[PDB]
Structures are given as structure tokens and as C-alpha cells.
Design a protein around this nucleic acid. Structure first.
Ligand SMILES: [K+]
Ligand SMILES: [K+]
Lengths: 233, 215, 169
DNA sequence: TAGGGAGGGTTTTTAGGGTGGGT
């Protein structure tokens, strides 16, 4: 009971629709043969969805209906690792995939009627899309033309048409947390992601200001820094 | 699969010290093979209850689980600041395992004014062939909010996307950013654009508009 | 295949203690004897369990411990008797899973001179072909594996394969 | 042959394995 129980996922990444991707779940701290290993996925903004499980001691496997027939779960006890090969991938299969272990080993065949999912991995991201890697096409820091007198003014930084996430972002400086918000990415029909980021600005003191953007795209190398100024027409 | 856990209310607001109740109903008999999980954003789920009434090791005793047939209840006696998360119920009595839809427990605060805004494109959208018209709601509560786009008389439908933030960890408020997308030809040949809000915190709906650039 | 991680059977446990308690108690005595097990895996009746080890070396060290007391009971470490099982055997155990339908036990099975059991497997009502013929050989059993080569049971032809851990693909 | 876990997955012939399929 002492040895550190740890599950590590690997093999996640980008796959074309209709292709096959295989996930690995390296297990340490317990005998994977006498437990049950479960795969759980979570779509962006959605809840948990159980995918598959394997119980090598009893040779029992189970799959969810939405993935039944396409996915295949297997275990290599010589490496203490569980596998989930996913075939005929679709856009609705894009999610973060976890592998988990049952709380107690398969002491009896009825053991699944009690206990729960004890230890979880970090979770790996699988993205199913025909789109290729691209960089951001950031747009405005445009304030309101009909502003107010010192009450409150709103800036912006729209980061559009990048693939894929993350887009870890800030503004001009390295730390300007003042009333700053970074909205979650949204998946557009074109297959690319668009995102917006705003900040709080005093409507009176805007002459000095600053408020350039700090858009960063990691696997794109497309750092674009746009500036703030009201338009002139 | 075919065994579904109907989780309610799937969302509730409460304060520290309140007693909350999250109930899952199984569509079929599962005896007691029910577990409860707590998940925080960006993190893996954590087990809380198994066998529908047994606390996992390390879980505080303020968590508990009862059973009254096919109904399974997760009870938090005194809500704690670190208990604000999403809770999921799980079934393992039948065949394939299924999770509930989850219940998000959000912090409770007073109602705040949205402070709507609306912005035009950015000189490259005008030179790239696409139009992105924004509408920002900033530091409002509750989350319930209805936004509306209007093409000079007509409610836009099927051409906008909006995303909401989590509760800010200084004021427990939200933020919304709706983005209507149209081609340049559609955008260049029209006048009067606006976004309308119907938040419960404002007595009368607030409409923010700009005829065109008008800078 | 019975798993790959080396493990040992631990017996004579204080069944009055819960499984989590027994997991801690068994781990502590090995830890006190400077041995780091990886899992404990208490059994259902809590009278026994199966201790996991990271290597065969740690296992062999564990078996040579003596007088280990957990909760007042002197536990006993046993190598599970799978070595006495078909791990040594099944070089002297054949399978002839009947390839047709239900047949008779006393059906004049004269195709095997030396064998200790040719009993088939039958269920409630009808049955399908499962009949393994035992053996009494030492250096494998190829004197019988290559000697049948398509006999004739009722219904259709038949086949003879391996069982246990010899025919496992 | 194809249903349930009181038939059994670390041993005493009921089968053993997971492409035979679901607890
Ligand atoms: K079976
Ligand atoms: K079976």
C-alpha cells in the first residue's frame, strides 16, 4: 500500500478524422494485472464520459456505446501499461483523455459493484481535425467611440484564427492583472479557434495608458503585439 | 451503456457554511455501486464517496452519501471555500460505467450590473474579408444573461459565438464576450448594429450601438 | 498469463482487522525489515493476501524472513504453488477439444494407450466439444502430439491442441 | 455452446480465454 501509485498518459496529439490514434497508460505502484484500468474523456466545456475499461485477471472488457466497436482497450502486463487504440476518430472524440485505476483490486468477480476510480493520470489531449497548424491574426484594441467621463472605458484584444490551442496570453507587461479577463477559446466552423481578451481602463486617464497586447502561440512561433488607440474616422 | 444517472440540479449557488444537496437518480437498479467525484478546473477528478455511503480515505467528514432506492444523494453539511467545484456521480452496477451530467457549485453573491460594451472591427478585418463585431459584458452576476444581435431590424440567428469566464476570485463575477461573424459584403452594405441584453440586474434592457465606424 | 509482477501469498492474517488496516500492517513489517513492497492486495475473507514486489530479488529476500507478526498473528509467506501446477506440466498434458458435438464418455476411446483422463466437459442439456486427454510423459509429450493427426470422432473430424500455458498464443 | 459470477481466473479435471461475449 506504500508504493507511490502513479498513472502516466502518452501518445495524445493531433489526428485526422477517420484516422487511428493509440493512447498509453503507464502504471506504477501496483500490479496492473489484478486491477481494472478505466479510460475517461472530457470534451471541452463538457462533463465526464466513461470510455472503456479492462480487467486482465478476469479477461473482462467494456466499452461505451458511443465508442463501442471503434475503440479497443488492451494491456501489456510485461510493461505494466494499458492501451486504448481509437479507430474511426471524429470531431466529437476531441477531448482530454484520462486513465484511472479502481480503488481496490479484483478480489472477487463482484468487486466492480463497490469502490471507485482511485488514481488518475495528468490527462492527455486528443484533437481530431482536418485543420493544420496556423498562427493568430489578432485584431483590435479599439475603445468605445462614444466613451464616458472617467466612469469606465473598455479595451480589447481579439485573437482570431489559430490552430491549435493553447494561446497563453497577457497584455503589454508581464503582470497587469488589473480587471483582466481571458475568455475560453471557441471552435469556429472553419476549424480554427478564436479568442478575446479585455481589461479595465479608467475612462478619464487614457492619455498616458499603454495597453499593447501580448498574444503568444506556442507551436506556431507567431507572437503578435497589437497596440491600443481610439480610432479617428 | 443504457444505464443513465440523472443528476440534478446540475448547478446551484451557495455560500460558505450552507448545507448543499446533490441528488442522482439511476434509471435502473444498481444496488449500491455508486461513487461521487469532485473536479476542479484544469485538474483530474478526485474520489469522494464509494459504495454510495463510504468516504474515501482523506475526504473530510462533512461529505456524506445516502441512498433511498434508485436515488443517491451527496450531502455537504457545511460548505467550505475549497468545496466550490463540479461534482459527478458514477454508476458501476450494470454493464458499462456511466457518469452523471455533473453539478456545478458556484459561489453566491449579490446581483451586479453587466456594464455592456460593443466594438467594431480592426482595420485588418476590413482588409482581410471578415467582420468581427464584439459585445462585452464585464463583471456581472448571476450568470443568467441573454444577448441579442440585430441587423437594423432583424435578430441575427446562427452567426454568433459567445464564451463566459469563471467566477473571478476577487468579486465572484462573470464576463461574457459574444462575437458575430459576417462577410465584408454583408457587413459593408448595412447600417445600425447593436447588441441587446436582458440581465435580471438591470430594470430595463440596455442596448449599445454604433451606426458605423463613426470615430 | 497470470500477470508479470512478482508476488507472494501471505496467509494467517488477523481477519478481524479491515483490509486497509491489513495493507498497512503487512507493509510496515516489511518496511521494518527494510523491504519496500509495491502493493498488498488483501483477499476477500481477509485471512490471506498477495504481496507484490518490484523484482524477483526483493521477493526471494522476503521469503527468507522469519517470525513476522502482524496484529498478533504470525503471517506465513508462500510461493503460490503454480510451479507445482502446469508451469512444470502441460509439457505432459494435452488437449483434444472435441471438434463436432456431444459424444459419449465410454465411447471406446482406443486412440490413446497411455493417458490418465479423457473426460469431456458437458453443461446442462446439450454440450459442445471440450475434452482434454491427460499424459504421463516426461520429455514433452511429442510421442502423442504428432501421433493423432486427424482421428475420427462422431459427426466430423477432430483436432488435438495444447492446453494451459503451452497453447497460449 | 454462449449466460452468469454459487463455474472459475494464484491448487486437488468442468474449459480456458478474451476474436466466443457481457458483468
Ligand atoms: K467469462
Ligand atoms: K465463460
Amino acid at each position: 500500500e506504500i508504493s507511490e501509485v502513479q498513472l502516466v498518459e502518452s501518445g495524445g496529439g493531433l489526428v485526422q478524422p477517420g484516422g487511428s490514434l493509440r493512447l498509453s497508460c503507464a502504471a506504477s505502484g501496483f500490479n496492473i494485472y489484478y486491477y481494472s484500468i478505466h479510460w475517461v474523456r472530457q470534451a471541452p466545456g463538457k462533463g465526464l464520459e466513461w470510455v472503456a475499461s479492462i480487467s486482465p485477471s478476469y479477461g473482462y472488457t467494456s466499452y461505451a456505446d458511443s465508442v463501442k466497436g471503434r475503440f479497443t482497450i488492451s494491456a501489456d502486463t510485461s510493461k505494466n501499461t494499458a492501451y486504448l487504440q481509437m479507430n474511426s476518430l471524429r470531431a466529437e472524440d476531441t477531448a482530454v483523455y484520462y486513465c484511472a485505476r479502481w480503488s481496490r483490486w479484483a478480489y472477487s468477480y463482484w468487486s466492480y459493484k463497490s469502490y471507485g476510480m482511485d488514481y488518475w493520470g495528468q490527462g492527455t489531449l486528443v484533437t481530431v481535425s482536418s485543420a493544420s497548424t496556423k498562427g493568430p491574426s489578432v485584431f483590435p484594441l479599439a475603445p468605445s467611440s462614444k466613451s464616458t467621463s472617467g466612469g469606465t472605458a473598455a479595451l480589447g484584444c481579439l485573437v482570431k484564427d489559430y490552430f491549435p490551442e493553447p494561446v497563453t496570453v497577457s497584455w503589454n507587461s508581464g503582470a497587469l492583472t488589473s480587471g483582466v479577463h481571458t475568455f475560453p477559446a471557441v471552435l469556429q466552423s472553419s476549424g480554427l479557434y478564436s479568442l478575446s481578451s479585455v481589461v479595465t481602463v479608467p475612462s478619464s486617464s487614457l492619455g498616458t495608458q499603454t495597453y499593447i497586447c501580448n498574444v503568444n502561440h506556442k507551436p506556431s512561433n507567431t507572437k503578435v503585439d497589437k497596440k491600443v488607440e481610439p480610432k479617428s474616422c | 451503456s443504457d444505464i443513465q444517472m440523472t443528476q440534478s440540479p446540475s448547478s446551484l449557488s451557495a455560500s460558505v457554511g450552507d448545507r448543499v444537496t446533490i441528488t442522482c437518480r439511476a434509471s435502473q437498479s444498481v444496488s449500491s455501486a455508486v461513487a461521487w467525484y469532485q473536479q476542479k478546473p484544469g485538474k483530474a477528478p478526485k474520489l469522494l464517496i464509494y459504495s454510495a455511503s463510504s468516504l474515501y480515505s482523506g475526504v473530510p467528514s462533512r461529505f456524506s452519501g445516502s441512498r433511498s432506492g434508485t436515488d443517491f444523494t451527496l450531502t455537504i453539511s457545511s460548505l467550505q471555500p475549497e468545496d466550490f467545484a463540479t461534482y459527478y456521480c458514477q454508476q458501476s452496477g450494470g454493464g458499462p460505467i456511466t457518469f452523471g451530467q455533473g453539478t456545478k457549485v458556484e459561489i453566491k453573491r449579490t446581483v451586479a450590473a453587466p456594464s455592456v460594451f460593443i466594438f467594431p472591427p480592426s482595420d485588418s478585418q476590413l482588409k482581410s474579408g471578415t467582420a468581427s463585431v464584439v459585445c462585452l459584458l464585464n463583471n456581472f452576476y448571476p450568470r443568467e444573461a441573454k444577448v441579442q444581435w440585430k441587423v437594423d431590424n432583424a435578430l441575427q440567428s446562427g452567426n454568433s459565438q459567445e464564451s463566459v469566464t469563471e467566477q473571478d476570485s476577487k468579486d465572484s463575477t462573470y464576463s461574457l464576450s459574444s462575437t458575430l461573424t459576417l462577410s465584408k459584403a454583408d457587413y459593408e452594405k448595412h447600417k445600425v448594429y447593436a447588441c441587446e441584453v436582458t440581465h435580471q440586474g438591470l430594470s430595463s434592457p440596455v442596448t449599445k450601438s454604433f451606426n458605423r465606424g463613426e470615430c | 498469463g497470470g500477470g508479470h509482477m512478482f508476488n507472494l501469498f501471505v496467509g494467517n492474517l488477523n481477519f478481524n482487522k479491515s483490509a486497509p488496516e491489513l495493507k498497512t500492517g503487512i507493509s510496515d513489517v516489511f518496511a521494518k525489515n527494510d523491504l519496500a513492497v509495491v502493493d498488498v492486495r488483501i483477499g476477500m475473507t481477509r485471512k490471506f493476501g498477495y504481496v507484490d514486489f518490484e523484482s524477483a530479488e526483493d521477493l526471494e529476500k522476503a521469503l527468507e524472513l522469519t517470525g513476522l507478526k502482524v496484529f498478533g498473528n504470525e503471517i506465513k509467506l508462500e510461493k503460490p504453488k503454480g510451479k507445482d501446477s502446469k508451469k512444470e506440466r502441460d509439457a505432459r498434458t494435452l488437449l483434444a477439444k472435441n471438434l463436432p458435438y456431444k459424444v459419449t464418455q465410454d465411447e471406446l476411446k482406443e486412440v490413446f494407450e497411455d493417458a490418465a483422463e479423457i473426460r469431456l466437459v458437458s453443461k446442462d442439456g446439450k454440450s459442445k466439444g471440450i475434452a482434454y486427454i491427460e499424459f504421463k510423459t516426461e520429455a514433452d509429450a511429442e510421442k502423442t502430439f504428432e501421433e493423432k493427426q486427424g482421428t475420427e470422432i462422431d459427426g466430423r473430424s477432430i483436432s488435438l491442441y495444447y492446453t494451459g500455458e503451452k497453447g497460449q498464443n
